[PDB]
Structure formats: C-alpha cells, structure tokens
Amino acid sequence: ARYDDVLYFPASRYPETGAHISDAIKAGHADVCTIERSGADKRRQESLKGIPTKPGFDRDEWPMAMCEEGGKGASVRYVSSSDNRGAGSWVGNRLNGYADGTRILFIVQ
C-alpha cells in the first residue's frame, strides 16, 4: 500500500496554507507524509536555506518538516502568520493520533 490513512486538509479554515499544499502537490511534491517527527529541525534548515523572512508571513513548507519527504527540495511559500500558525497547530493535534512511520495521504485537491 501507498498510505495508511487519509487527511482532508481544512482549507476553509486555513486557506492560504491549503492553497500552498494543493499547488505543491500539483507541482509533484509528495502527497503522502511519512511521519518522522525527530528530524524536523534539520529538515527546516534545509528547506528554508537562503529564503529571507518577510514581516507578517511565515515560510510554509510542503512537504512538511515533520515528514520524511520534507527538507531539501520542498516547496516554500510565504503564508500569513495567523493562517500558517493555526494550520500548524491543527496538523500537530490531528496527527497526534498516529505514530511515527504512519503514512498519511493529504487531500486538498
């Protein structure tokens, strides 16, 4: 199998994050997150290298840094901080029901 469970991303609540994820998947970035939480700092170092900060915005990454698929090569987009921080908290809580190694297909479309 390709994935273990599916997650329908809450695009109505966090539309800017959702739009990024949708576009990134249509650009060939992985739609499955193989959860690997320990590596997330190293993966952010890699994905964000050389990308300046912008006020009012966070640098959103897809694939996410908490996934094996993240890090080097990830799509990065400036997303309003409230949208991105809300999405981040939502995802961390929702995925807290799944052990590391679980493969989650994200669907936004």
Residue numbers in the entry: 34 to 142
Question: How does the study describe this entry?
Answer:
Here, we have characterized NucB, a biofilm-dispersing nuclease from a marine strain of Bacillus licheniformis, and present its crystal structure together with the biochemistry and a mutational analysis required to confirm its active site. When the secondary structure of the single stranded substrates were calculated, position 20 tended to occur at the boundary between predicted single and double stranded regions of the DNA. It has already been shown that BlNucB had no detectable activity against total RNA purified from the periodontitis-associated oral bacterium Veillonella parvula in comparison to the positive control, RNase A. Therefore, BlNucB is a Mn2+/Mg2+-dependent, non-specific endonuclease that can cleave both single- and double-stranded substrates, but with a preference for double stranded DNA. BlNucB diverges from this general description because glutamate replaces the histidine, and this glutamate is essential for biological activity; therefore BlNucB is the founding member of a novel subfamily of the His-Me finger nuclease superfamily.
To understand the molecular basis of its nuclease activity, the structure of BlNucB was solved by single wavelength anomalous dispersion (SAD) from the intrinsic sulphur atoms in the protein and refined to a resolution of 1.35 Å. Overall, BlNucB is a single, compact domain comprising five β-strands and three α-helices that forms a rough triangular pyramid with an approximate diameter of 25 Å. The core of the protein is formed by the five β-strands in a bipartite β-sheet, with β-strands with topological order 1, 5 and 2 separated from β-strands 3 and 4 by the β3-β4 loop that breaks the continuity of the β-sheet. Instead, the flat base of the pyramid contains a 15 Å deep, 10 Å wide, 20 Å long concave depression that is formed mostly by conserved amino acids. The base of the depression is predominantly negatively-charged, whereas the lips of the cavity are mostly positively-charged. There is no metal ion bound in the apo structure of BlNucB reported here and, despite repeated attempts, we were unable to obtain diffracting crystals containing either bound divalent cations or oligodeoxynucleotides.
